[PDB]
Design a protein around this ligand. Structure first.
Ligand SMILES: O=C(/N=c1\ccccn1Cc1ccc(Cl)nc1)C(F)(F)F
Ligand SMILES: O=C(/N=c1\ccccn1Cc1ccc(Cl)nc1)C(F)(F)F
Ligand SMILES: O=C(/N=c1\ccccn1Cc1ccc(Cl)nc1)C(F)(F)F
Ligand SMILES: O=C(/N=c1\ccccn1Cc1ccc(Cl)nc1)C(F)(F)F
Ligand SMILES: O=C(/N=c1\ccccn1Cc1ccc(Cl)nc1)C(F)(F)F
Lengths: 200, 200, 202, 197, 199
C-alpha cells in the first residue's frame, strides 16, 4: 500500500464528528504549549497577545494500518480527522492558526497536530516590568466533552524568539478540572503558567 | 448503538433549516448569559465590549434516541442542527464566537449550546465610574420568529467573571420582554439582561 | 403540509440564481433604512460608520403555496432564495450583516429580508458639530440589474439608540436613477439623506 | 427560452478553470479603472488606499445563446464563470470587493464584470500637497497567463467628498518580462495624478 | 488535446492531499523569495511587515502530457494540486496571499506557484537606521514533512519597490534544517537573510 491508499483508507474510516472512544474509555489528549513570542502586553487592561505551538496528541485506533511494507506515517488535513474541541477559557480572541492545518497520523492510530497559534488572553500582567515578572495563566480544555469522554494531560525558552522585548523566566503546565454550578460533570483542563518579564 | 450510530441518525433526521415546532406550539428557547469579561467601556460613546457564555437550550424531539444501551449525550456541530436565530437588538458588532461551535444533544432531544461570545453593544454606560455603577441593558431574541413560533425565557453573577477585568459586576438581572415593530401586530420575545457594573 | 414540506418545496422550486421576473416586468424591490446607531464620524476624511436595518421586500410568485391548511409564513436562509444584488454606491466597506441571514417568505410569494448592517460611507460630514447638522446621502440600488429587470422604490428616530452621541434631525428616502456614460441602461436607486448632529451643543 | 433556461445552460456549459481561447488566439481582456475615492495617503511611506470600479470585459463564445425570442443578457455569479486572474503588481493589500460578485453575460458570449475594489498600493506619493500633485502608477495584468494566453488592453464618478481631487488619469498598455523566462505578461499601467484640495 | 483536456487529466490524476513522492525519494521543492516591499519596521518590537514573491517549484511527473501538438503549460487552481505545506517559522501573522491562487503545470510535470505574500515577522531589526543596516532572517520549510519526504533547496533589488522608505543591501538564501528535541526527524528549510536599511 502507498500513501494514496493510506489516505483513501483514512477517508473511508475517519469520522471527523465522532470522538474515537475505545471501551467507553475517555480519549486521552496530551496538550503542551511551546511559547514562540509575546507580542503585546497591556498592564492596565491585563491583556497579552502571544504566539505558541500547541502540541496536541491522541490515539484514533480506527485509523491504524499495517506498515510492515508501507509508510508508517502520513500528513492528513485536520478536516478529514476527529480533532479535540480544545478552547482556552480566558481567550479574548479566536485562535489565529498561522501554519498549514495538517496532522500526522502514525500507522498505530496515534495523531499529532502542532498548530502555531496567535491568540489574545485576559490574564495577570501585573509585575511584567519587574525582575520577578508577571505570571499569566492560560487554561485549555475540552469545551463540550467532560472527563468521561476526554481527559487532558500535560507533558522553556528553547523555541522562544531571541528578538522579543520579553523573556521567559519559567513555564509550568499543571492538570486541573472545572465543574459548573449547574451540572455534576467535570471538564478537564491544562493550566499553563507563563512567568515572563520585559528584558532589562 | 454507539456514538457513530447516534450521529448518523442525527444526520438522517435533523433539518437545520426547519424550526422543530411540536403541534402548533412555539419552540421554548431558554437563554441565560454568564459574564466572563468586560474589556472596554466608553462613557462618551456609550459602548461596551464584553465576553459572555450564552447558555441556550431547547428541545428538538425529532433527534431523540433509545439510550438504554447507548450513550445518552453526544457533541454535534451546530451546522447539523436547527439553532434559534437569536440576535442582540443593541449589538454594534457581529457576535465573535470564541469556542468550538458544538452543541450537546441529549437522547430525549434536549439541545444545549453554550458559545463564548465577544461582542460590542450600545447601552447606558452613565455612572460606570461611580459606586452605584452603570446599568447596561442587552436585549436578545429571535430576529425572524414571532412569539407563536419561538418563545424566549430566562433562567452568583460574578462566579465566572475575570478577576483581571478593570471592572466588577454589582448585579445581573435577566427578565422576559417583548418587542413589537411599528408596521405589524406580531410580537418578538426577548430576554432583557441588565448588567450593573462599575470600574474597580 | 408542515413547515418541513414548505421548505422542501421552496428548495425544489426556488432558483437563487434567477431573477423572478413575471411577464416582462421588472421585479419591484422595496428598500427602506431604519438608522440604529452612528458609531464613528470623521469630518476631515468625510467618513461615517453606521448601523441600520435594511428593510427589503419583493415578490417571487414561484415560491407561493396553498396555506388554507398549512403555515402561511416560514423563515428561510437567504442562500435558498433569489435576493436582489443591492449595493450602496458610496460604501467604502463591505456590508457587515450583524443578524441571522434569514428571510420571511409568505404563502403568496412575498419575501421580507431585514438584515442589520454595519457599513462605512464616503459622504458629506461637514456641519455635524453645528445646529443644522451634516447631511450624509447613501445611494442603494441593484449593482447589475437595470430598471427593466429591477425597480427600486422607497416607502425617523423610532429605532435610533437613545445612547448615541448623535441625534437624527431628519431622514428622507427618494427614488432616483443612475445611467453610465458608456451604456443605455438606467439603474434605479433609493437616495437616503441622513441629517444628524452631535447632541448637547452650546 | 426564459432566464432560468439561459442560466441553467450557462451553469451546464461554463468551465471556470479553463481560459476560453478561440483558435490559437489570446483571450482579449479589456480593463479600465474608474476612481471613486482616495481615502488615505502617506507621503512618508508612499502608500495610498483607493476605491475604484475595475471595468473588465472579455468573450467566452461557449456561453452564447440565440436571443431572437429570449433575454439578450443575464447576471451570473463569477464563481460560475472563468474570470481573468488579474492582479495589481504594486498592491500591498488583497483587493477588497465591496459589491455583489456578479458578472453580466451577453447572448454573444461577451462577459462584463465591474467590481468596486478598495485596495492599498505602494506608489509615488511625492508632491501630493503641491499644485502639480503626486502621480501614483498602478500596474494590473494577468498573474499567471503570458501574452499568448491573455492580452490586456485599456473624475466623472470620483467622490466630491474626498479630501483629494483628480488632476488626470492615463491608462497605457504595457508588458512585464521576468529575468527568468522568455514569456511577456501584458498589463495596463494606470497613472493617477491627484492632489490634496 | 486542448487546455480543457489537459486540466481534466490533471483533475482526474492529481491527489491534492498526497505528497507525489517517486520511489522512496523526497519531493525536491525549490523556494526563492523576491522582496517587493518593506512596509513597516519596528526597532523596539523587532517586527517587520514585508511583501515578497515566494517562487515555489516541484515536480509531479504523474501530471505530464505530450505537448508536440498541444499547449505545454496551463494555469491550475492550487486546490486541484498537491502543494508543499510551507510555513515561515518566525512569522507572527498569517500569510496574506495578494494574488490569484493559480499554479502553472508544465507538460513535463513541473509545477510553479508564485504567490505574492504580505506577512509580519519577528527578526533582528537592530541597525536599520545605520549604513550597514539590519539583517532580518526568515526561515521557510515544510511544517509537517521531514527531510525524507520533502527537501527544500534555494536557487536582489530587481523587483524591490523604488518607493519603499527602505532599500536592500543584500539577500542571501541558504539551505538549513531544524530538528525537534522530541524526535530524530530533520525538517529542511531555506534561511533568507534580508540585509536592508532606511534610505
Ligand atoms: O514535535 C514535532 N514537530 C514540531 C514541533 C514544533 C514545531 C514544528 N514541528 C513540526 C511538526 C511535526 C508534526 C506536525 Cl503534525 N506538525 C508540525 C515532531 F518532531 F514530532 F514532528
Ligand atoms: O452548562 C454547562 N457547561 C458549561 C457552562 C459554561 C461554560 C462551559 N460549559 C461547558 C459546556 C457544556 C456543554 C456545551 Cl454544549 N457547551 C459547553 C454544563 F454543565 F451543562 F455542561
Ligand atoms: O419589519 C419587521 N420586522 C423587523 C423590523 C426591524 C427589525 C427587526 N424586525 C424583525 C424581523 C422580522 C422578519 C424579518 Cl425577515 N427580519 C426581521 C416585521 F415586523 F414586519 F416583520
Ligand atoms: O461601469 C459600469 N456599470 C456600473 C458602475 C457602477 C455601478 C453599477 N454599474 C452597472 C453594472 C453593470 C454591469 C455589471 Cl457586470 N456591473 C455593474 C458599466 F456599465 F460601464 F459597466
Ligand atoms: O517567474 C515567472 N513569473 C513570475 C515571477 C514573479 C511574479 C510574477 N510572475 C508571473 C507568474 C508566472 C507563473 C506563476 Cl505560477 N505565477 C506567476 C515566470 F515567468 F516564470 F512565469
Amino acid at each position: 500500500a502507498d500513501r494514496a491508499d493510506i489516505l483513501y483508507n483514512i477517508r473511508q474510516t475517519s469520522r471527523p464528528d465522532v470522538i474515537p472512544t475505545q471501551r467507553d474509555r475517555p480519549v486521552a489528549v496530551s496538550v503542551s504549549l511551546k511559547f514562540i513570542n509575546i507580542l503585546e502586553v497591556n498592564e492596565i487592561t491585563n491583556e497579552v497577545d502571544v504566539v505558541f505551538w500547541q502540541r496536541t496528541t491522541w490515539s484514533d485506533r480506527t485509523l491504524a494500518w499495517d506498515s510492515s511494507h508501507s509508510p508508517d506515517q502520513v500528513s492528513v488535513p485536520i478536516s478529514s480527522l476527529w480533532v479535540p474541541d480544545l478552547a482556552a477559557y480566558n481567550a479574548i480572541s479566536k485562535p489565529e492558526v498561522l501554519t498549514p492545518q495538517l496532522a500526522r497520523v502514525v500507522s498505530d492510530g496515534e495523531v499529532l497536530y502542532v498548530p502555531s497559534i496567535r491568540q489574545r488572553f485576559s490574564c495577570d500582567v501585573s509585575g511584567v516590568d519587574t525582575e520577578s515578572g508577571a505570571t499569566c495563566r492560560i487554561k485549555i480544555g475540552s469545551w463540550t466533552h467532560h472527563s468521561r469522554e476526554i481527559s487532558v494531560d500535560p507533558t522553556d525558552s528553547e523555541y522562544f524568539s531571541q528578538y522579543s522585548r520579553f523573556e521567559i523566566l519559567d513555564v509550568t503546565q499543571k492538570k486541573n478540572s472545572v465543574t459548573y454550578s449547574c451540572c455534576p460533570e467535570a471538564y478537564e483542563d491544562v493550566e499553563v503558567s507563563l512567568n515572563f518579564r520585559k528584558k532589562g
